[PDB]
Design a protein around this motif. Structure first.
Motif, short mmCIF file in Angstrom:
data_model
loop_
_atom_site.label_atom_id
_atom_site.label_comp_id
_atom_site.label_asym_id
_atom_site.label_seq_id
_atom_site.Cartn_x
_atom_site.Cartn_y
_atom_site.Cartn_z
N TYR A 1 -10.43 -4.10 13.15
CA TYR A 1 -9.46 -4.77 14.01
C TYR A 1 -10.16 -5.60 15.07
O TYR A 1 -9.88 -6.80 15.24
N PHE B 1 -13.28 -6.62 15.15
CA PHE B 1 -14.09 -7.68 14.56
C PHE B 1 -13.24 -8.86 14.14
O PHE B 1 -13.60 -10.02 14.38
N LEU B 2 -12.10 -8.59 13.50
CA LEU B 2 -11.22 -9.68 13.07
C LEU B 2 -10.71 -10.47 14.26
O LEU B 2 -10.66 -11.70 14.22
N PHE C 1 -13.54 -9.22 2.55
CA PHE C 1 -12.39 -10.05 2.19
C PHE C 1 -12.14 -9.99 0.69
O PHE C 1 -11.00 -9.83 0.24
N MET D 1 -2.26 -8.75 6.42
CA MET D 1 -2.50 -7.72 5.41
C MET D 1 -3.20 -6.51 6.02
O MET D 1 -2.81 -5.36 5.76
N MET E 1 -10.84 -6.51 -0.44
CA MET E 1 -9.42 -6.31 -0.21
C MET E 1 -8.60 -6.76 -1.41
O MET E 1 -7.68 -6.06 -1.85
N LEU F 1 -13.81 -23.13 17.48
CA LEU F 1 -14.80 -23.88 16.72
C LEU F 1 -14.14 -24.93 15.83
O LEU F 1 -14.64 -26.05 15.70
N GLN F 2 -13.01 -24.58 15.22
CA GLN F 2 -12.30 -25.53 14.37
C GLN F 2 -11.73 -26.68 15.19
O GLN F 2 -11.72 -27.82 14.73
N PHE G 1 -3.19 -14.77 7.17
CA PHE G 1 -2.90 -13.94 6.01
C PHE G 1 -3.70 -12.65 6.06
O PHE G 1 -3.16 -11.54 5.89
N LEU G 2 -5.01 -12.77 6.31
CA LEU G 2 -5.86 -11.59 6.36
C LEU G 2 -5.43 -10.65 7.47
O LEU G 2 -5.39 -9.42 7.27
N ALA H 1 -19.89 -21.26 10.26
CA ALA H 1 -18.48 -21.59 10.18
C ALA H 1 -18.22 -22.59 9.06
O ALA H 1 -17.32 -22.39 8.23
N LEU H 2 -18.99 -23.68 9.02
CA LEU H 2 -18.82 -24.67 7.96
C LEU H 2 -18.91 -24.01 6.59
O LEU H 2 -18.07 -24.23 5.71
N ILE I 1 -14.62 -28.99 15.81
CA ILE I 1 -14.94 -29.79 14.62
C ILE I 1 -13.88 -30.86 14.39
O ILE I 1 -14.19 -31.99 13.98
N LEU J 1 -22.85 -22.65 14.05
CA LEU J 1 -22.12 -23.80 13.53
C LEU J 1 -22.21 -23.86 12.01
O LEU J 1 -21.21 -24.10 11.32
N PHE K 1 0.37 -14.13 -4.63
CA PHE K 1 1.70 -14.02 -4.04
C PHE K 1 2.65 -15.04 -4.66
O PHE K 1 3.46 -15.66 -3.97
N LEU L 1 -10.23 -18.42 -0.82
CA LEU L 1 -9.40 -17.26 -0.54
C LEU L 1 -7.93 -17.64 -0.42
O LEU L 1 -7.06 -16.85 -0.79
N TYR M 1 0.80 -1.22 0.00
CA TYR M 1 0.00 0.00 0.00
C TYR M 1 0.83 1.28 0.00
O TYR M 1 0.84 2.04 0.97
N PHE N 1 -4.66 -15.98 -2.51
CA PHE N 1 -3.40 -15.52 -1.97
C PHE N 1 -2.22 -16.26 -2.59
O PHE N 1 -1.20 -15.65 -2.92
N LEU O 1 -13.50 -12.65 15.58
CA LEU O 1 -13.79 -13.73 14.64
C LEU O 1 -12.75 -14.83 14.73
O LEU O 1 -13.08 -16.01 14.75
#
Ligand SMILES: CCCCCCCCCCCCCCCCCC(=O)OC[C@H](COP(=O)([O-])OCC(O)COP(=O)([O-])OC[C@@H](COC(=O)CCCCCCCCCCCCCCCCC)OC(=O)CCCCCCCCCCCCCCCCC)OC(=O)CCCCCCCCCCCCCCCCC
Ligand SMILES: CCCCCCCCCCCCCCCCCC(=O)OC[C@H](COP(=O)([O-])OCC(O)COP(=O)([O-])OC[C@@H](COC(=O)CCCCCCCCCCCCCCCCC)OC(=O)CCCCCCCCCCCCCCCCC)OC(=O)CCCCCCCCCCCCCCCCC
Ligand SMILES: CCCCCCCCCCCCCCCCCC(=O)OC[C@H](COP(=O)([O-])OCC(O)COP(=O)([O-])OC[C@@H](COC(=O)CCCCCCCCCCCCCCCCC)OC(=O)CCCCCCCCCCCCCCCCC)OC(=O)CCCCCCCCCCCCCCCCC
Ligand SMILES: CCCCCCCCCCCCCCCCCC(=O)OC[C@H](COP(=O)([O-])OCC(O)COP(=O)([O-])OC[C@@H](COC(=O)CCCCCCCCCCCCCCCCC)OC(=O)CCCCCCCCCCCCCCCCC)OC(=O)CCCCCCCCCCCCCCCCC
Ligand SMILES: CCCCCCCCCCCCCCCCCC(=O)OC[C@H](COP(=O)([O-])OCC[N+](C)(C)C)OC(=O)CCCCCCCCCCCCCCCCC
Ligand SMILES: CCCCCCCCCCCCCCCCCC(=O)OC[C@H](COP(=O)(O)OCCN)OC(=O)CCCCCCCCCCCCCCCCC
Ligand SMILES: CCCCCCCCCCCCCCCCCC(=O)OC[C@H](COP(=O)(O)OCCN)OC(=O)CCCCCCCCCCCCCCCCC
Lengths: 78, 62, 80, 63, 65, 129, 77, 129, 65, 78, 78, 78
Positions: free
Chosen positions: G41, G43-44, K67, G6, K70, G54-55, G2-3, L59-60, G58, L56, L77, L69, D42, L73, G47
């Protein structure tokens, strides 16, 4: 060999694609108003609160449309 | 699990517990490093390297 | 209240209104730290860990540490 | 390591060549590297792309 | 609550506003000068490119292929 | 190096004793008895009072704005108010000039590239400055 | 990640090289951008915090489902 | 433009009434009755007190110097004093760096004429800066 | 008059002294750089004079008086 | 080597893509005029209010349609 | 033979494609509000809890659109 | 003759294509919440339980969008 090429008609193609996203917005508007009428018929007493919420939905959906539209115009003039 | 503990009501209370004292010191470091970078990296006397075009990471990773 | 995501715990009442109304409050027996106790600011009168050390002083100390970390090489540069 | 690589490649391609510089020059170069890091994707691209007609040394300066 | 005998707060606000306006004037002037210098440097580079191209053309004619 | 320090301390002590302010002397005596610093305590008191008077300043600002806008201020205008307004205008002008100087970060206006004075910039003795 | 990298790079860039706009006449735009960046910031971070847990849930649930697919339960009598 | 001003004034008035400081409220009431400004009066009082406490500061400085030189300060040294001394050292270092930057009037050291970086000075986009 | 519980005045004096010393360091550095640049400019002028003298000598030889 | 190329006929392609944005806009209108019938049949006493809202939604969708139409024409005569 | 070519204007094409990702996002947002009206009309007392969930869904959907956006801006500046 | 060509700019095109996958994901997420609102209005006693299942599902569905995504990248990249 190193060759650099500059095509001056590909700033049109990108612009057209950015306009396609408007369809996902325009259709979204109809869905909100497609279900607003049903809600009004179901509960006519809430003709006002539902209308305000629908306006909120339309504005937010239009916000996505204008974010895409900004890219459309930037690449049209650049 | 965020169940309990000392919670200062406002900034002036951060000195009522050693842990929050260290926390506010760290926050001061964090937020004050940015103005330092503003002053250092936007300085009038700052000059780009003349040989900056001799080499770059972009050609290396390419 | 909250400080970012950290929420101040609140004790659930245990007495009923009838029993509660019969309680006589005598702040003379309370410790000096907790007088005119306020749930929204229970640590207003709490003593400082170090006398004369304000929160702003620590914040400024951290800022000065950052400034040193970023500017020391400008004044005392070293060769590779 | 990245900073040292930049200094070496941009100022002779050898460690001794860099050491031939003064501490202030090394400071300037390293701060320019920090500038480049901050700009990342950027920011202006003249920091690594040489505009046509520029008089500054090119990639074959030391070759 | 009698009428104010002094207007210190309004005067302080006006002082701040005047300083801010002066700062804006200086910033605008500096930005305009910077843009002018950027354009001048771009023109200089373009002229250098044209001169190099002319020299290359003359050398090509001397080559005579 | 020591006689001078003793002389300065003695002079300051004489001056401190000379003042006949009851409040100042009382505060000095109390702090000396407690071993604390009076000046620092005064500074902290002033800062606390100002911190507690910020919204008072805001309310006073709004009240003064209403007083001026209502025209009541000009109804009782006198020569003293004229003097104060002249002082106010002078401060405004000097602040504007200082703000411009800081905004452009230079005492003098910058030289345009097309100006004939560019040579002076090229012929600087010390380019760093 | 990655997100996050950036976005943090973008925030660093704008904060460092465009904070002077606070002292300029376009300060409102910078303030709006800074507020949006702070919101993004937060929110990310929320999340990512939720998604990691959660992962893991699962990841363990897939193994448990594998096990359960071949379990047979007898009834007491 | 007017509703916002009224809302801000109302909020400041609510906050001003909220505070339960007897001295602050008393001063506010007195100044409102007299129509004067409390904050300005506080500023003038603080400046007067500091003006009258200058020689007190000098005497305290000499007393503290004697206390430190006598070794009594280190006799009762504790961890809190160590923390304060670390804060003091940090402020000294940062002040020294700031002083150097201001003294040379440049964030970075000036470039010597014999350095190879002189080209960068020559190739400045805006020579004025 | 009890012993002082704080050393604020000494700390303030030390702050001022540290800032002053830093200022002296910066001033010395700037003065040295200025002297170096003055000497460099003097050398440049001397070299220009020598080059002009050499050119004049060559032109004199071409004149051949 | 530096090569600059200018392809002339690509201004047509960008125009065609923007036209696709109308697909959603036209579909969105159909959704509104589809639910309107269901709402009217359910509650015939509110035809006027539902009809007005249907017109409102049609206008909002048509706005996006003109945005895409604007881009198409600009890339057509440019 | 080894030939290396660098086409400049392609970044416009890629950016336009990412803009299309906002079509579903805009449509998805509109769907949420349309469903919200029906739920409110069929259960008018829950005009706030449903509103909160609609906002939560919009935020997540907006996040997906961001997303993609971006990449759309990043490629446009690459 | 054997000619080998390496076009650099193509990586932008592939990156934009992957972003299109988010259109389905963003739409899919909105579908879940739309049903959630229309379900909470049919059985509000389970709102907390439904909200859990909605998350739930989010997320899935979101996990898939990350896969696309990631490819964006990788090519952007490289
Ligand atoms: C609720 C949330 C809490 C945090 C949650 C966690 C974190 C979340 C993330 C965000 C955090 C934001 C930052 C934290 C808050 C900071 C502010 C604060 O609360 O201070 C209260 C504090 C009072 O607290 P206190 O504990 O009661 O203090 C008692 C006294 O201070 C007495 O103290 P003392 O006894 O220790 O005294 C020490 C001593 C020491 O005093 C001093 O030294 C005074 C300070 C001097 C300046 C030093 C630099 C200051 C820092 C600047 C850079 C900051 C970067 C980081 C900011 C990030 C903000 C986001 O004092 C003096 O001697 C008096 C000073 C007299 C000198 C005055 C003249 C100074 C001239 C300066 C010259 C240099 C200028 C530059 C150019 C020079 C050129 C040659 O109020 C102040 O004094 C503030 C003054 C400064 C205001 C601007 C500061 C920067 C911007 C802050 C924005 C914050 C926004 C918050 C929004 C919230 C919305 C709900
Ligand atoms: C290009 C851009 C570059 C940008 C770089 C970055 C810019 C800064 C960004 C921020 C960085 C991070 C933050 C760092 C903050 C550091 C400062 C700070 O916090 O200060 C608070 C700190 C006190 O904090 P504290 O310990 O928490 O205070 C507790 C209580 O609040 C105490 O309450 P209180 O009631 O005591 O309140 C009063 C107190 C608090 O007042 C203040 O807050 C003052 C203002 C604070 C900011 C100071 C910033 C200084 C930065 C460098 C200079 C810039 C210009 C500053 C202009 C200030 C105008 C007043 O006043 C003082 O501090 C007094 C200090 C002056 C003492 C004067 C005594 C001189 C005696 C000389 C005797 C010589 C005898 C020789 C005999 C030889 C025989 C052989 O005060 C200082 O550090 C004062 C430093 C003053 C330095 C002045 C240097 C001037 C230049 C040298 C002198 C040249 C002319 C004269 C030469 C004469 C011949 C020798
Ligand atoms: C390269 C080198 C160049 C060198 C150039 C030359 C350098 C100077 C050489 C000497 C020249 C001759 C002498 C000239 C002296 C002039 C100054 C003077 O005497 O002042 C005394 C004078 C008061 O004297 P007085 O009337 O006799 O006082 C009677 C009582 O003592 C009153 O007692 P008190 O109790 O009231 O005491 C407190 C009082 C006294 O405090 C002081 O004394 C303050 C410090 C005095 C020196 C100030 C020098 C300023 C010079 C330019 C800036 C340099 C940096 C200054 C840093 C200061 C840090 C505190 O505080 C104030 O003055 C407060 C002023 C700030 C008001 C803030 C209100 C903001 C409201 C904004 C609302 C916006 C709403 C918009 C809604 C729109 C809706 C559509 O105060 C001022 O003039 C204050 C001026 C402050 C200007 C600040 C400008 C900052 C930059 C612009 C802002 C950018 C950031 C924020 C932007 C935000 C977006 C908009
Ligand atoms: C006995 C002989 C008499 C004369 C005989 C005839 C002439 C003979 C020839 C020689 C004459 C020498 C000059 C006359 C004496 C001047 C000093 C004096 O008496 O002042 C008392 C005076 C108290 O008298 P007062 O009538 O009771 O005043 C009540 C209050 O002031 C309250 O006043 P207010 O209610 O009006 O308040 C107005 C308002 C207004 O207050 C202010 O505005 C405060 C002032 C701010 C600075 C403005 C510039 C000041 C002037 C500097 C240049 C001076 C050049 C000329 C000096 C020549 C010296 C020879 O105040 C405030 O709001 C409080 C200020 C809070 C802000 C503090 C922070 C300021 C930051 C400044 C930022 C700008 C820095 C530059 C860089 C910026 C970069 C961005 O004490 C002071 O306040 C002095 C402070 C300044 C000290 C340094 C001044 C320069 C050097 C003077 C050397 C004098 C040597 C004498 C040796 C005698 C041996 C026996
Ligand atoms: C005979 C006896 C003679 C004795 C003479 C004694 C002379 C002493 C002279 C002064 C010495 C000063 C030493 C200290 C300063 C060193 C500065 C330095 O080296 O900086 C370079 C280093 C940096 O090295 P660098 O320069 O390599 O780093 C630069 C890195 N880049 C380029 C990426 C930016 O600075 C620091 O590390 C600064 C860290 C902070 C220092 C201050 C710490 C204070 C304590 C804070 C923690 C505790 C808080 C607790 C709070 C809560 C309490 C409950
Ligand atoms: C919510 C608000 C409050 C929040 C507070 C949070 C903490 C923030 C703390 C901020 C601390 C200061 C921030 C410093 C910003 C950057 C300063 C700087 O170095 O910028 C000046 C810079 C000079 O360089 P220039 O020649 O313009 O170009 C360089 C290119 N090689 O040029 C530029 O960058 C252009 C600047 C133009 C606009 C100038 C605006 C300021 C004008 C008055 C400044 C007065 C400062 C006086 C200090 C004296 C220092 C000795
Ligand atoms: C008894 C004592 C008290 C008596 C008080 C009586 C009233 C006096 C009022 C004084 C007011 C300020 C005086 C200003 C002095 C001169 C300032 C100046 O412009 O000098 C800077 C100048 C810059 O130019 P330079 O590159 O060095 O060479 C120019 C040649 N073409 O370079 C020089 O001139 C060299 C300077 C080297 C030494 C620097 C000393 C100061 C260091 C700290 C300064 C901090 C200032 C911060 C202000 C910020 C401003 C935005």
């Amino acid at each position: 060999s190193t060759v650099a090429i500059s095509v001056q008609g590909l700033h049109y193609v990108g612009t057209g694609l950015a306009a396609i996203a408007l369809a996902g917005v325009g259709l979204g508007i109809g869905t909100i108003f497609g279900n607003l009428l049903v809600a009004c018929a179901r509960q006519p007493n809430l003709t006002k609160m539902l209308f305000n919420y629908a306006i909120l939905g339309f504005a937010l959906t239009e916000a996505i449309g204008l974010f895409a539209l900004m890219l459309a115009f930037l690449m049209l003039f650049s | 699990m965020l169940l309990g503990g000392f919670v200062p009501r406002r900034f002036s209370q951060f000195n009522r517990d050693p842990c929050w004292m260290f926390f506010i010191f760290s926050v001061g470091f964090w937020l004050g490093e940015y103005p330092a970078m503003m002053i250092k990296y936007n300085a009038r006397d700052l000059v780009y390297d003349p040989h900056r075009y001799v080499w770059s990471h972009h050609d290396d990773h390419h | 209240y909250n400080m970012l995501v950290f929420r101040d715990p609140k004790r659930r009442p245990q007495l009923s209104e009838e029993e509660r109304a019969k309680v006589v409050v005598n702040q003379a027996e309370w410790p000096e730290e907790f007088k005119d106790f306020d749930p929204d600011d229970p640590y207003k009168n709490s003593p400082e860990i170090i006398k004369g050390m304000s929160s702003w002083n620590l914040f400024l100390w951290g800022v000065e540490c950052a400034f040193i970390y970023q500017f020391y090489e400008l004044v005392f540069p070293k060769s590779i | 390591d990245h900073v040292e690589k930049a200094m070496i490649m941009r100022w002779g391609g050898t460690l001794e060549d860099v050491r031939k510089l003064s501490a202030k020059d090394q400071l300037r170069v390293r701060c320019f590297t920090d500038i480049e890091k901050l700009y990342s994707a950027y920011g202006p691209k003249d920091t690594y792309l040489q505009p046509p007609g520029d008089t500054l040394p090119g990639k074959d300066f030391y070759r | 609550k009698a009428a104010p005998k002094t207007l210190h707060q309004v005067r302080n606000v006006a002082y701040f506003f005047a300083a801010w306006l002066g700062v804006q004037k200086g910033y605008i002037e500096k930005s305009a000068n910077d843009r002018l210098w950027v354009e001048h440097q771009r023109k200089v580079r373009q002229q250098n490119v044209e001169r190099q191209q002319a020299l290359d053309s003359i050398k090509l004619m001397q080559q005579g292929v | 190096l020591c006689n001078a320090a003793s002389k300065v301390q003695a002079r300051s002590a004489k001056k401190l004793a000379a003042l006949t302010d009851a409040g100042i002397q009382k505060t000095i005596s109390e702090h000396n008895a407690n071993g604390t610093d009076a000046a620092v305590s005064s500074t902290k008191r002033y800062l606390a009072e100002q911190r507690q008077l910020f919204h008072y300043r805001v309310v006073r600002f709004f009240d003064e704005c209403h007083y001026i806008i209502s025209g009541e201020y000009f109804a009782q205008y006198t020569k003293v108010n004229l003097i104060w307004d002249l002082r106010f205008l002078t401060k405004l002008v000097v602040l504007f000039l200082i703000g411009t100087v800081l905004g452009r970060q230079s005492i003098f206006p910058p030289i345009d590239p097309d100006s004939p004075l560019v040579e002076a910039l090229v012929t600087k003795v010390n380019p760093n400055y | 990640h990655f997100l996050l990298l950036m976005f943090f790079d973008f925030f660093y860039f704008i904060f460092v090289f465009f904070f002077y706009g606070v002292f300029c006449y376009w300060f409102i735009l910078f303030i709006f951008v800074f507020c949006f960046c702070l919101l993004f910031y937060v929110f990310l971070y929320l999340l990512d915090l939720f998604a990691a847990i959660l992962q893991l849930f699962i990841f363990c649930n897939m193994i448990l489902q594998l096990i359960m697919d071949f379990l047979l339960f007898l009834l007491f009598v």
